[PDB]
Short mmCIF file of C-alpha atoms in Angstrom, two decimals:
data_model
loop_
_atom_site.label_atom_id
_atom_site.label_comp_id
_atom_site.label_asym_id
_atom_site.label_seq_id
_atom_site.Cartn_x
_atom_site.Cartn_y
_atom_site.Cartn_z
CA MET A 230 0.08 0.43 0.01
CA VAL A 231 1.28 3.62 0.05
CA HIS A 232 4.10 4.44 2.71
CA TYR A 233 4.09 7.32 4.92
CA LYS A 234 6.25 8.59 6.72
CA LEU A 235 6.00 11.47 9.10
CA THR A 236 9.37 13.58 9.97
CA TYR A 237 9.01 16.18 13.15
CA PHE A 238 10.19 16.97 16.57
CA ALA A 239 10.65 14.99 19.18
CA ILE A 240 7.28 16.52 20.40
CA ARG A 241 3.51 17.23 19.84
CA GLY A 242 3.75 20.25 18.01
CA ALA A 243 2.13 21.39 14.24
CA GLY A 244 3.18 17.31 13.27
CA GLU A 245 -0.13 16.47 16.00
CA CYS A 246 -2.55 16.78 13.60
CA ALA A 247 -1.00 14.37 10.98
CA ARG A 248 0.06 11.49 13.81
CA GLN A 249 -4.24 12.30 15.07
CA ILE A 250 -5.85 11.67 11.55
CA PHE A 251 -3.48 8.67 10.85
CA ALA A 252 -4.90 6.65 14.15
CA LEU A 253 -7.83 7.98 13.33
CA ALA A 254 -7.57 5.85 10.09
CA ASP A 255 -5.62 3.32 11.28
CA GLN A 256 -2.85 4.02 9.18
CA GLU A 257 0.74 2.66 9.79
CA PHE A 258 3.52 5.99 9.06
CA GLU A 259 6.66 6.13 10.12
CA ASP A 260 6.86 8.29 12.29
CA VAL A 261 10.15 9.94 12.87
CA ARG A 262 10.84 12.69 16.01
CA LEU A 263 14.17 14.58 15.27
CA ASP A 264 16.20 16.86 18.14
CA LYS A 265 17.11 20.01 17.15
CA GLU A 266 20.82 19.13 16.22
CA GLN A 267 19.74 16.56 13.43
CA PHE A 268 17.13 18.96 12.96
CA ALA A 269 20.31 21.24 11.06
CA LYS A 270 21.61 18.47 9.19
CA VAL A 271 18.66 17.57 7.07
CA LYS A 272 16.09 20.53 6.88
CA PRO A 273 18.29 21.53 3.49
CA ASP A 274 16.54 18.31 1.84
CA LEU A 275 13.49 19.89 2.85
CA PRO A 276 11.17 22.01 0.86
CA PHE A 277 10.66 24.98 2.53
CA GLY A 278 13.93 23.91 5.23
CA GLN A 279 11.44 23.09 8.05
CA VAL A 280 9.23 20.80 9.80
CA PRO A 281 7.21 18.66 9.80
CA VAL A 282 7.46 17.41 6.77
CA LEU A 283 5.49 14.41 5.09
CA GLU A 284 6.42 11.64 2.09
CA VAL A 285 4.12 9.79 0.71
CA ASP A 286 5.92 6.66 -1.47
CA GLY A 287 8.86 9.02 -0.94
CA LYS A 288 7.15 12.41 -2.90
CA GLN A 289 7.69 14.83 -0.08
CA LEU A 290 5.39 16.89 1.33
CA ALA A 291 5.58 19.89 3.75
CA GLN A 292 3.51 22.75 5.72
CA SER A 293 1.54 20.96 8.85
CA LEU A 294 -1.42 22.63 7.37
CA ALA A 295 -0.86 21.39 3.39
CA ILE A 296 -0.19 17.63 5.31
CA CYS A 297 -3.26 17.62 7.64
CA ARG A 298 -5.96 18.70 4.74
CA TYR A 299 -4.34 15.90 2.29
CA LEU A 300 -4.59 12.95 4.73
CA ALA A 301 -7.84 14.08 6.06
CA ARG A 302 -9.11 14.13 2.62
CA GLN A 303 -7.06 10.62 2.47
CA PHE A 304 -9.59 9.83 4.85
CA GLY A 305 -12.66 11.31 5.08
CA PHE A 306 -11.84 13.53 7.68
CA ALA A 307 -11.64 17.05 5.78
CA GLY A 308 -15.47 17.58 5.39
CA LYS A 309 -18.25 16.13 3.71
CA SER A 310 -17.95 18.61 0.83
CA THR A 311 -16.08 20.98 -1.29
CA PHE A 312 -17.22 23.87 1.00
CA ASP A 313 -17.95 22.13 3.73
CA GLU A 314 -13.87 21.93 3.02
CA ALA A 315 -13.47 25.70 2.86
CA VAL A 316 -14.63 25.74 5.95
CA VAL A 317 -12.61 23.59 8.06
CA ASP A 318 -10.12 25.35 5.93
CA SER A 319 -11.39 28.47 6.96
CA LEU A 320 -10.76 27.14 10.80
CA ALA A 321 -7.86 25.58 10.51
CA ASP A 322 -6.83 29.52 9.09
CA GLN A 323 -8.43 31.87 12.09
CA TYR A 324 -5.96 28.88 14.22
CA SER A 325 -2.95 29.52 12.72
CA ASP A 326 -3.44 33.83 13.29
CA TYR A 327 -4.25 33.26 15.79
CA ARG A 328 -1.02 31.09 16.63
CA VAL A 329 0.98 33.83 15.26
CA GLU A 330 -0.80 36.26 17.45
CA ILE A 331 0.09 34.14 20.67
CA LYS A 332 3.63 33.30 18.76
CA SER A 333 5.80 35.22 21.50
CA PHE A 334 3.81 33.91 24.79
CA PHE A 335 3.96 30.77 24.02
CA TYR A 336 7.76 29.97 22.62
CA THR A 337 8.75 31.99 26.46
CA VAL A 338 6.37 29.50 28.05
CA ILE A 339 8.10 26.29 26.79
CA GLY A 340 10.92 27.47 28.29
CA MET A 341 11.87 28.15 24.43
CA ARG A 342 12.22 32.30 25.21
CA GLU A 343 13.49 34.72 27.05
CA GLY A 344 10.56 37.36 28.63
CA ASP A 345 7.85 37.74 31.92
CA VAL A 346 5.74 35.03 31.24
CA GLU A 347 2.31 36.64 33.75
CA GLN A 348 3.11 39.95 31.70
CA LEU A 349 3.13 37.79 28.96
CA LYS A 350 -0.29 36.44 29.65
CA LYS A 351 -2.26 39.77 30.31
CA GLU A 352 -1.33 41.52 26.84
CA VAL A 353 -0.59 38.77 24.36
CA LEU A 354 -2.40 35.83 25.29
CA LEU A 355 -5.03 36.83 27.03
CA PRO A 356 -6.97 38.69 24.29
CA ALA A 357 -5.68 36.98 21.08
CA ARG A 358 -7.59 33.62 22.88
CA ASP A 359 -10.71 35.46 23.66
CA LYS A 360 -11.32 36.43 20.05
CA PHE A 361 -10.41 33.13 18.77
CA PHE A 362 -12.56 31.50 21.45
CA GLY A 363 -14.92 33.65 20.60
CA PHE A 364 -14.86 32.91 17.07
CA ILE A 365 -14.93 29.42 18.31
CA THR A 366 -17.80 29.68 20.24
CA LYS A 367 -20.37 30.80 17.91
CA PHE A 368 -19.39 27.95 15.09
CA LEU A 369 -20.02 25.57 18.22
CA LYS A 370 -23.34 26.91 19.64
CA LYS A 371 -24.71 26.46 15.18
CA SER A 372 -23.69 22.88 16.03
CA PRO A 373 -26.11 20.23 17.70
CA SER A 374 -23.70 17.51 17.33
CA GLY A 375 -20.35 19.63 19.14
CA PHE A 376 -18.50 19.36 16.14
CA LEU A 377 -16.94 22.32 14.55
CA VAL A 378 -17.79 21.43 11.09
CA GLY A 379 -21.18 19.60 10.14
CA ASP A 380 -21.77 16.43 12.21
CA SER A 381 -18.33 14.62 11.75
CA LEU A 382 -15.41 14.49 12.98
CA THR A 383 -12.81 16.86 10.74
CA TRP A 384 -9.48 17.84 10.88
CA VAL A 385 -9.65 21.49 12.83
CA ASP A 386 -12.02 19.41 15.61
CA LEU A 387 -8.17 17.82 16.50
CA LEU A 388 -6.10 20.63 16.23
CA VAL A 389 -7.94 22.74 18.47
CA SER A 390 -9.02 19.90 21.00
CA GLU A 391 -5.56 19.08 21.33
CA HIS A 392 -4.06 22.42 21.32
CA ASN A 393 -5.98 23.47 24.01
CA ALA A 394 -5.71 20.04 25.83
CA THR A 395 -1.48 21.58 25.87
CA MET A 396 -1.99 24.67 26.61
CA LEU A 397 -4.03 23.24 30.22
CA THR A 398 -0.63 21.39 31.33
CA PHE A 399 0.76 25.62 31.16
CA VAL A 400 -1.90 28.27 31.91
CA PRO A 401 -5.03 25.81 34.46
CA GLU A 402 -7.54 28.79 33.96
CA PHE A 403 -7.12 28.58 30.11
CA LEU A 404 -11.46 27.51 29.55
CA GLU A 405 -12.79 29.95 31.80
CA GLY A 406 -15.17 31.82 30.30
CA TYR A 407 -15.91 29.17 27.40
CA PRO A 408 -17.83 26.04 28.57
CA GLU A 409 -18.72 25.22 24.59
CA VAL A 410 -14.68 24.84 23.47
CA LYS A 411 -14.14 22.56 26.82
CA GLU A 412 -16.67 20.34 25.94
CA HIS A 413 -15.21 20.18 22.88
CA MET A 414 -12.29 19.22 23.81
CA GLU A 415 -13.20 16.74 25.66
CA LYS A 416 -15.78 15.43 23.37
CA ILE A 417 -13.29 14.97 20.51
CA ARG A 418 -10.79 14.04 22.82
CA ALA A 419 -12.94 10.73 23.95
CA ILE A 420 -13.44 9.06 20.67
CA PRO A 421 -12.32 5.82 20.86
CA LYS A 422 -9.34 5.57 18.86
CA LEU A 423 -8.08 9.31 19.29
CA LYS A 424 -8.28 8.54 23.41
CA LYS A 425 -5.62 5.39 22.35
CA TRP A 426 -3.44 7.05 20.77
CA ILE A 427 -3.26 9.99 23.55
CA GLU A 428 -3.18 7.20 26.00
CA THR A 429 0.16 5.25 24.17
CA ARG A 430 1.91 7.98 22.73
CA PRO A 431 4.84 9.51 23.03
CA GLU A 432 4.81 11.29 25.99
CA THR A 433 6.49 15.04 25.49
CA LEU A 434 5.13 18.30 26.74
CA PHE A 435 4.29 20.01 24.01
CA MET B 19 -27.12 29.04 -11.55
CA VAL B 20 -24.48 29.65 -8.92
CA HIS B 21 -24.41 33.44 -7.88
CA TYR B 22 -20.76 34.24 -5.95
CA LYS B 23 -19.94 37.52 -4.14
CA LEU B 24 -17.39 38.80 -3.10
CA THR B 25 -17.01 41.26 0.16
CA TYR B 26 -13.80 42.90 0.94
CA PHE B 27 -12.17 46.26 0.31
CA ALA B 28 -11.87 48.93 -1.59
CA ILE B 29 -8.18 47.70 -2.24
CA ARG B 30 -6.79 44.47 -3.71
CA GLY B 31 -5.01 42.56 -0.24
CA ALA B 32 -6.32 39.94 0.83
CA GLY B 33 -9.74 39.67 -1.95
CA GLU B 34 -7.60 39.44 -5.65
CA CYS B 35 -6.64 36.12 -5.32
CA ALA B 36 -10.48 35.29 -5.46
CA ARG B 37 -10.43 37.54 -8.16
CA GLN B 38 -8.70 36.58 -10.49
CA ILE B 39 -9.93 32.61 -10.31
CA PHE B 40 -12.87 34.75 -11.40
CA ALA B 41 -11.32 36.45 -14.07
CA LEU B 42 -9.77 33.30 -15.10
CA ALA B 43 -12.41 31.05 -15.05
CA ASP B 44 -15.37 33.76 -16.77
CA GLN B 45 -17.15 33.47 -13.83
CA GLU B 46 -19.33 36.86 -12.85
CA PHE B 47 -19.43 37.46 -9.37
CA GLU B 48 -20.19 40.69 -7.38
CA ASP B 49 -17.48 42.91 -6.33
CA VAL B 50 -18.93 44.59 -3.25
CA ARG B 51 -15.86 47.01 -2.08
CA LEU B 52 -16.47 48.44 1.34
CA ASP B 53 -15.67 51.73 3.17
CA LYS B 54 -14.93 51.63 6.77
CA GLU B 55 -18.26 52.77 8.33
CA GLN B 56 -20.16 49.45 5.52
CA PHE B 57 -17.51 47.41 6.62
CA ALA B 58 -18.45 47.71 10.33
CA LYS B 59 -22.32 47.72 10.21
CA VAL B 60 -21.33 43.89 8.21
CA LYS B 61 -18.26 43.42 10.92
CA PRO B 62 -21.21 41.24 14.05
CA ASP B 63 -21.86 38.94 11.14
CA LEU B 64 -18.88 37.92 9.42
CA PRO B 65 -17.64 34.39 10.55
CA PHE B 66 -14.32 35.80 12.24
CA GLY B 67 -14.89 39.98 11.81
CA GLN B 68 -13.40 39.75 9.35
CA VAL B 69 -13.20 40.90 4.93
CA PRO B 70 -12.75 38.86 2.64
CA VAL B 71 -15.68 37.11 3.18
CA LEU B 72 -17.19 34.98 -0.65
CA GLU B 73 -20.93 33.96 -0.47
CA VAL B 74 -21.88 31.37 -2.35
CA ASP B 75 -25.60 31.14 -3.05
CA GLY B 76 -25.48 32.81 0.49
CA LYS B 77 -23.32 30.74 2.69
CA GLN B 78 -20.49 32.71 3.47
CA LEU B 79 -16.78 31.95 3.34
CA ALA B 80 -14.04 34.06 5.09
CA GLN B 81 -10.32 33.69 4.85
CA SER B 82 -8.49 34.47 1.99
CA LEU B 83 -6.46 30.81 1.03
CA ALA B 84 -10.17 29.47 2.17
CA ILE B 85 -11.76 30.61 -0.69
CA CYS B 86 -8.81 31.22 -3.25
CA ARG B 87 -8.25 27.11 -3.37
CA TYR B 88 -12.06 26.10 -3.03
CA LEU B 89 -13.04 28.89 -6.16
CA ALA B 90 -9.30 26.59 -8.09
CA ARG B 91 -11.11 23.62 -6.94
CA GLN B 92 -14.46 24.50 -8.75
CA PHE B 93 -12.43 26.01 -11.35
CA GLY B 94 -9.61 23.94 -12.08
CA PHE B 95 -6.50 25.79 -10.72
CA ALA B 96 -5.94 24.41 -8.19
CA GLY B 97 -3.37 21.63 -9.03
CA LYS B 98 -4.03 18.06 -11.16
CA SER B 99 -3.43 15.76 -8.34
CA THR B 100 -4.63 15.40 -4.58
CA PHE B 101 -1.08 15.45 -3.53
CA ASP B 102 -0.33 18.53 -6.02
CA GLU B 103 -3.69 20.48 -5.01
CA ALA B 104 -1.24 20.06 -1.59
CA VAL B 105 1.98 21.30 -2.64
CA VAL B 106 0.03 24.09 -4.56
CA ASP B 107 -1.65 24.15 -0.14
CA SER B 108 1.62 24.43 0.76
CA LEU B 109 3.58 26.97 -0.90
CA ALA B 110 0.48 29.29 -0.62
CA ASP B 111 1.61 28.82 3.08
CA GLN B 112 5.14 29.41 2.72
CA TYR B 113 4.08 32.56 0.81
CA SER B 114 1.57 33.42 3.89
CA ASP B 115 4.17 32.69 6.52
CA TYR B 116 6.81 35.19 4.42
CA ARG B 117 3.82 37.94 4.45
CA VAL B 118 3.82 37.66 8.45
CA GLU B 119 7.61 37.95 8.82
CA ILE B 120 7.38 41.12 6.33
CA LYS B 121 4.08 42.25 7.59
CA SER B 122 6.38 45.07 9.28
CA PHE B 123 7.76 46.71 6.58
CA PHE B 124 4.00 45.84 5.24
CA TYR B 125 2.29 48.58 7.25
CA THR B 126 5.24 50.99 6.68
CA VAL B 127 4.92 51.62 2.89
CA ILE B 128 0.87 51.42 3.15
CA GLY B 129 0.77 54.12 5.54
CA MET B 130 -1.12 51.37 7.82
CA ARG B 131 1.83 51.64 10.46
CA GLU B 132 5.26 53.66 12.42
CA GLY B 133 8.62 52.44 11.32
CA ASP B 134 12.05 53.85 9.08
CA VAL B 135 11.41 52.64 5.62
CA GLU B 136 15.39 52.32 5.29
CA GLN B 137 15.67 50.44 8.41
CA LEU B 138 12.67 48.05 7.74
CA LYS B 139 13.54 47.10 4.17
CA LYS B 140 17.26 46.79 4.79
CA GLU B 141 16.78 44.29 8.09
CA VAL B 142 13.21 42.59 7.46
CA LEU B 143 12.01 42.53 3.78
CA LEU B 144 15.07 41.99 1.71
CA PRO B 145 15.65 38.98 3.97
CA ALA B 146 12.62 37.51 3.81
CA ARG B 147 12.36 38.08 0.03
CA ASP B 148 15.64 36.27 0.36
CA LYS B 149 14.67 33.49 2.32
CA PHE B 150 11.46 32.91 0.00
CA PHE B 151 12.73 33.78 -3.19
CA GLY B 152 15.10 31.12 -2.99
CA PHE B 153 11.96 28.59 -2.67
CA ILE B 154 10.22 29.92 -4.95
CA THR B 155 13.45 29.39 -7.46
CA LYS B 156 13.76 25.48 -6.35
CA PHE B 157 10.25 25.28 -7.55
CA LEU B 158 10.82 26.92 -11.22
CA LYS B 159 13.95 25.49 -11.60
CA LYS B 160 12.60 22.48 -10.93
CA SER B 161 8.66 23.31 -13.57
CA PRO B 162 9.70 22.62 -17.51
CA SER B 163 6.37 24.74 -18.12
CA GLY B 164 6.89 27.78 -15.80
CA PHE B 165 3.95 27.52 -13.54
CA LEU B 166 5.69 26.53 -9.86
CA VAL B 167 3.48 23.28 -9.76
CA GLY B 168 2.50 21.02 -12.66
CA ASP B 169 2.42 21.99 -16.15
CA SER B 170 -0.38 24.10 -16.00
CA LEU B 171 -1.77 27.77 -13.56
CA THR B 172 -2.51 27.31 -9.96
CA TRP B 173 -3.54 29.64 -7.31
CA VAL B 174 -0.26 30.26 -5.82
CA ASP B 175 1.18 31.39 -9.11
CA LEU B 176 -1.39 34.13 -8.93
CA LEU B 177 -1.28 35.32 -4.83
CA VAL B 178 2.72 34.41 -5.65
CA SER B 179 2.53 36.82 -8.92
CA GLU B 180 -0.23 39.50 -7.91
CA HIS B 181 3.01 39.91 -4.55
CA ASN B 182 5.40 40.37 -6.66
CA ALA B 183 3.99 43.16 -8.97
CA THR B 184 2.76 45.29 -6.03
CA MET B 185 5.77 45.02 -4.31
CA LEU B 186 7.30 46.66 -7.13
CA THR B 187 5.67 49.34 -6.95
CA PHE B 188 7.07 50.64 -3.44
CA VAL B 189 10.27 48.85 -3.89
CA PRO B 190 11.75 49.17 -7.38
CA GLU B 191 14.85 47.01 -6.57
CA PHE B 192 12.78 44.41 -5.18
CA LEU B 193 13.20 41.41 -7.66
CA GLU B 194 16.85 42.15 -8.72
CA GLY B 195 18.94 39.04 -8.43
CA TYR B 196 15.75 36.96 -9.35
CA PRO B 197 15.06 36.71 -12.83
CA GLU B 198 13.23 33.68 -12.88
CA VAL B 199 10.50 35.18 -10.41
CA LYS B 200 10.89 37.92 -12.94
CA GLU B 201 9.33 35.56 -15.83
CA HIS B 202 6.84 33.98 -13.48
CA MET B 203 5.11 37.27 -12.79
CA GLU B 204 5.33 38.52 -16.00
CA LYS B 205 3.79 34.46 -17.54
CA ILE B 206 1.41 34.50 -15.70
CA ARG B 207 0.03 38.53 -15.49
CA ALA B 208 0.34 37.52 -19.92
CA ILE B 209 -2.34 35.52 -19.51
CA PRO B 210 -4.88 36.72 -21.60
CA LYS B 211 -8.20 36.58 -19.44
CA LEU B 212 -5.93 37.76 -16.32
CA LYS B 213 -4.39 40.38 -18.60
CA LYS B 214 -7.79 41.75 -19.37
CA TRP B 215 -8.90 42.58 -15.43
CA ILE B 216 -5.55 43.73 -14.06
CA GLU B 217 -5.95 46.65 -16.89
CA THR B 218 -9.68 46.52 -16.24
CA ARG B 219 -10.14 46.16 -12.15
CA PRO B 220 -10.23 49.51 -10.48
CA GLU B 221 -6.74 50.88 -9.96
CA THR B 222 -5.70 51.17 -5.66
CA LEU B 223 -2.75 51.63 -3.97
CA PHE B 224 -2.16 47.91 -2.56
#
């Protein structure tokens, strides 16, 4: 069959969505986890000199979003129509904008950058999250099934549920003003094959 | 009969790549260009409070990339295989990473934010275009046909060529060490249905 290989760091981060799609599909893949120094050696061979990279039968595909969308389409977690597919897409991009907003908080909290936590929480993380969650919860309120688009799992469900789960580990009161978002993170993560993966996957933080 | 409406500002920006596919596909649409006050009355009703928004028989879709991809799939400008569609997706995502890096210089020229144009250009813009252009050149040099993916026009071809033409009007030597980038811009813009649009669309600053 198709051979899949995902090359990324030894964290969840931007590789985890792919992993979560594979586990939802019962799809074997080679899960290759690099440290900093091995990234430095292989990166000139990557399409944009960056991880995560997906090879399918040796053919490279980079960019988490493009990878996550591709695998979802292959295994039917993209949306049930091309329009719902675009809607999934639009939420995943809104999520990414958010992530750009908070890049200075996250990289400080994960100990990879210099800065003041509580202050970067106040001025950068909490605003950015309010806007993002404000929009996310409108989608959730118009969804009786609890999934972000339609009434079936799509790849954004994973992006957002997994990020929230990670955040709680750094910011215990992250879901404070947002009961729907919390309900969503628990609904997605209790999906048996996903649940199995969260239990068995390598343990990192973030 | 499918009715399309594009809602955006009186500006090229995030709306234009949608407009260009509509030009290539010979597809009628309502080009709705709003001002400050108009946007503000409508803002609460947009899915993430932002334009561009596309209405497809009344269904809203936000986020420029989600929008262009969806349009591209409809009219055969997305890629020839779902993998190629992935690779186009990833160059679009790289393009946007590069727009995030250059934001600071972009809002300065545009007269949106403060900051020095000698500084920001040397320090932010040109090293970022250097990184990015090496990528685009690599895909170009891999292509016998001139497009960035495959032997056919794709929607990242439109985003990349429209940004270069735009940047060219703030930075006269953006593109000086980069003949194949220039040839790509010239080649995409000469496509007759797109040429006619560039010549007939309203003239705006950006």
